[PDB]
């Protein structure tokens, strides 16, 4: 389509760094019987960890992306129903401006 | 059948070598020569055969012979049908798999469907179609160029004799 374009690919590494500095409990020491509702965080299909307050983190991410600070090419989705928060740095993704 | 098809003849021993019209050659420009895939495949059968012959003639090392045998078995097999299940394919340097005898007869475009059941022909023409409310139902309008290329071989009889002379 006219407005359409494709992703070229970003380094997920700095986004992963912001995550652990925004309250992300790492998967390695997650206890499911203790936090059975904690929202799971994904970066390019890699389960990096878990998050207690997902809404605030999401807000911080979006306002970082609209600022330019985090690439506007990067995908950021919260699945309130499935208690999931996936992110994509991935190239090949077709996007349009809104 | 005792006369035309015995079980023993399902095993090959003597190989019919097809004449060139079956497997054509083209001598281009003295450093460029084109040989048919079947000719390549026969050169492999022969090379393999010549080798096994020497092996059996000389000191037969058993396992070294059965090795050479299965290679001859392949080249022979692979020449009739190259698209064998399980087996690797005979390949022409380009990566192109060898057009076996089976391959040639095989599909729609194959010797049967594409060359016998159907065939391009002479004394045929094709152009765009347009409607003519002034033409008759049974009539077909023919562009002069086509009419001037397409022909009828009328035989000289004392009826057409004078008219045919005029056309000539």
């Amino acid at each position: 389509s006219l407005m359409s374009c494709i992703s070229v690919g970003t380094d997920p590494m700095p986004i992963i760094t912001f995550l652990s500095e925004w309250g992300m409990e790492p998967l390695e020491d997650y206890v499911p019987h203790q936090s059975p509702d904690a929202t799971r965080v994904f970066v390019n299909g890699v389960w990096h960890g878990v998050h207690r307050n997902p809404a605030r983190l999401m807000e911080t991410l979006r306002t970082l992306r609209r600022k330019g600070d985090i690439n506007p090419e990067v995908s950021m989705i919260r699945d309130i129903r499935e208690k999931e928060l996936k992110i994509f740095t991935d190239a090949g993704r077709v996007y349009r401006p809104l | 059948n005792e006369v035309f098809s015995r079980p023993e003849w399902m095993i090959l021993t003597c190989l019919p070598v097809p004449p060139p019209p079956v497997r054509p050659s083209i001598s281009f420009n003295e450093s460029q020569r084109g040989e048919d895939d079947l000719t390549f495949k026969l050169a492999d059968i022969l090379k393999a055969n010549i080798s096994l012959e020497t092996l059996e003639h000389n000191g037969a090392p058993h396992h070294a012979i059965e090795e050479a045998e299965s290679l001859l078995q392949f080249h022979v097999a692979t020449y009739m049908d190259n698209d064998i299940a399980g087996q690797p394919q005979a390949l022409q340097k380009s990566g192109r798999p060898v057009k076996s005898i089976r391959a040639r007869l095989k599909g729609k475009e194959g010797r049967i469907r594409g060359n016998l059941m159907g065939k391009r022909v002479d004394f045929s023409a094709r152009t765009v179609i347009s409607g003519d409310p002034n033409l008759e139902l049974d009539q077909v309008g023919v562009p002069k160029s086509i009419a001037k290329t397409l022909t009828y071989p009328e035989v000289v009889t004392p009826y057409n004799i004078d008219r045919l002379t005029q056309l000539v």
Partner: protein
């Protein structure tokens, strides 16, 4: 061909390709009815087909002048293939590799091919160097000349003909050249017609 009907020394005969006949221009008699498109015929040996889909592509080209008469077919992995047989059959081909001292000297071509690509030289230069070498290597006129310098001399012989400019000092550095030796070997070959 020549027209039976007339027969004047220079036979003025035309190829009416579109009408598919070989005709005598002088009398009008068609001498042949069967006529082939050579260019389209050649396209069954050399083509766009690498895939092996084309029912037209039925043959393969060769270079008699260089390859000689060696018709061979790779045993390779197809759509359905158990790797076991591909190994077995190729292992078998190895034992059957008992090729002559000159059927192993085609490895000197593999050297020139590796030397041309390294010299950033064209395909035509190789086919000329591999040509001049194939004609002089067995020569008595050359005898016991430094074998390393004989093939390097054929690379300059190939470059001279293909108009691809290369200095003696360039080819000298490319392999290793004993100046007087590779100047003498380049003259016996140049003398070889």
């Amino acid at each position: 061909l020549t027209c039976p009907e007339c027969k004047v020394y220079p036979p003025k005969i035309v190829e009416r390709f579109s009408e598919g006949d070989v005709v005598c221009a002088l009398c009008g008699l068609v001498l042949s009815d069967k006529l082939v498109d050579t260019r389209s015929e050649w396209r069954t040996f050399s083509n766009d087909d690498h895939n092996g889909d084309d029912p037209s592509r039925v043959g393969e080209a060769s270079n008699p002048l260089l390859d000689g008469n060696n018709l061979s077919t790779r045993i390779g992995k197809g759509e359905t293939t158990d790797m076991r047989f591909t190994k077995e059959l190729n292992k078998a081909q190895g034992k059957n590799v008992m090729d002559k001292k000159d059927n192993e000297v085609q490895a000197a071509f593999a050297k020139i091919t590796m030397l041309c690509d390294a010299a950033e030289l064209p395909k035509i230069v190789k086919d000329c160097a591999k040509e001049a070498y194939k004609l002089c290597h067995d020569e008595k006129t050359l005898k016991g000349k430094s074998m390393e310098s004989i093939m390097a001399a054929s690379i300059l012989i190939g470059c001279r003909r293909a108009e691809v400019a290369r200095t003696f000092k360039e080819i000298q550095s490319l392999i290793h050249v004993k100046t007087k030796e590779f100047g003498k070997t380049l003259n016996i070959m140049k003398n070889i017609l």
